[model samples]
Target: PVSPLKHFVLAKKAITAIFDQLLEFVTEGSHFVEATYKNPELDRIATEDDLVEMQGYKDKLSIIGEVLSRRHMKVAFFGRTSSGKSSVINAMLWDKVLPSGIGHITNCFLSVEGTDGDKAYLMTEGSDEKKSVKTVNQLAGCLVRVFWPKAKCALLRDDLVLVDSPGTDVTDSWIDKFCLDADVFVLVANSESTLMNTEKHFFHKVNERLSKPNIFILNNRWDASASEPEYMEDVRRQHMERCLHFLVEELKVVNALEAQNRIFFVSAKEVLSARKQKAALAEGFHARLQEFQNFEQIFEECISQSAVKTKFEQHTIRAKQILATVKNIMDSVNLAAEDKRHYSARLPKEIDQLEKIQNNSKLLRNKAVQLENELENFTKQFLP
Candidate 1:
């Protein structure tokens, strides 16, 4: 029997394969556009504007191909410096692969993936160089790379890839490119610095562009309030209320009601420690872990409902647009051919006039040569 995790893996693979096929179809459509519409022989029939528009359509399909080629749902972790974002990733992974600290350990975006083999490496961005690491402990690098020996947590390994971003303060428009196609966003904020303007502004910008409702707000290090139960409860309540207000009232996310279930107060450090020890977690930590699992479930559902559905819809629309363009080009070609046939049928009359002109020219040339010979003979006899 296939376990739930195995089933999830199989489903993702199947969906990825479907996307691949769709990408292939789009690619073939682009080629058809090139061969039929963009062909030099059809330049008169297909206008410059038509070729440019078809190129734009081809580029859109290329974008979709790039998005779907990863074969895993991209979940970006965004937050301030030392907000336990990395720790939360490590916790979710149930392994200490990501380097976490009180200060900035993640200099650039780290895109983590499960490698098929027992190898780990960092692939630098600009140079595209791969630096192999003997172990996960040596993952401190400048840019992103895929890690091996999949996460111990089944939820993290198969269908999802967690991307750890730099601090919110350090981000700019350049970061948008990394998360443009992300399936989910995890906004990690610490209890000490809950919902700062930086975090709010960053996420607001992200929402403005992506408008992804699968965002989850993680208030990490909630254990800081454990000393005072009353303060802890108040903190949780206040953070939750503020986050909800921003998402619902300010951002006006369509699914604010569903987003209520996405917010979580968790202690990433505690969860990681407990998981590392292989011991039962405290009530709060256990609840947080369960919440993480719930997020995974929601992520899966969102992938099916949103990403897959949208891709198929886009593929259908593009296919129709391509077919319409092809039909118009074909119609123009046929019309041009018909006009050429009409011109060809009338060409026999013009050809006869050309032959008569050529014969008249030949007779005139012969008469001129004979006159020139007679004139030469008369001149010679008179001189003798």
Candidate 2:
């Protein structure tokens, strides 16, 4: 039996086929428009009613296309020296797979991914050409590709790709281009101090290529401060506000008014502490640092929120592209009944891939409903 997702894909293909037929019915030229708007004789062939309906259908198709396109989420982690780029990746995967803070000892554009067994490395076609790295050390200084396994969460779906970028100060032009390619930028700023000019410079450069909404800034080293919880929060808020205001005033930045341009506070030391505790437990040893493991929740929350927003925006963009392609194909062609059938038979299969995604989404919704019911029953028991 076909899974719910397969069924959904089949349905979406059917819908896309209908849209294709509608497109075939409307041909390019002044006559089609005249019949659509002016002629009573050919009113049924192309009418305002049909135009309005097609427009609505077009919007829906666009949305679905966008969602399908966003299946492969690209995220970049960037910050200055020792900002915990590697540690954060480890926390995300719930494992310490990548080497942390080996510094100049290991500087390769490494792509660390969570695999079921071992690791594999593949050089990006243009990476070596775009950047000059003579020694293995210099090559290590390049961008690192990290893949978080699907077991991490649905958000890190098999297609998701995360990149850990080298410090921006190393090579402005080379690193800037790499960071911009990411759909979302995760900037790991050190929380111990104010935003440096280098970070500001890098931020501005990155913003030039991508939308501000695509950036997720993190203030690392939260445990270093002796300040109270509220004070720490205020410090992060101040720097974040200054960064945004600086962008607006100095850089003349505008757009994404709805996006929250604030800094998320994370303690890399705390993450390390948690890892140590887990290691100790696994090794049949005990550690006092186990108490600090609770801080992992903070990092998890920050990463999760960033992922959700990025995913939504990416999917929205992709859906628009897919819809546009369909509309263009429809407007450019005229088809007979037999041609329409042939076109749809071929087209729907191609669209089936995305329709499957929509079906999976529907299944997720059903699962959520079930969980909600269970929660309600548990709450009722407590009340009684």
Candidate 2 lDDT by residue in tens digits, 1-384: 322223223333333443343233322222333333453422133345545544555445444544444333456677776777766666555555455554445545555444342333333445633222123243463454444345543334334466666665564564454554455566777777676778777767766665653555566766655446577557857876766665556545443352243335566555555655565222211221232233333323433444434444343333334334433322322222234334553566434533433343344334334433433443342212
Estimate the overall C-alpha local distance difference test score of candidate 1.
Answer: 0.60
Give a tens-digit lDDT track for model 1, residues 237-314. Answer: 899888888777776774567767777777888878878877344445666666666665665565544444333344
Query: Model 2: which ten-residue window has the lowest total lDDT?
Result: 283-292
Per-residue error at 60 for model 1, in Å? 12
lDDT of each: 0.60, 0.47
| Top lDDT model | 1
Candidate 2 regions off by >4 Å?
1-71, 102-108, 113-155, 175-177, 211-213, 226-241, 247-261, 275-384
Please list all clashing residue pairs in model 1, or write none if there are none.
none
Error of 2 at 308 (Å): 11
* Residue ranges of candidate 1 with Cα displaced over 4 Å: 1-71, 127-129, 133-142, 151-157, 254-256, 279-283, 310-312, 320-384
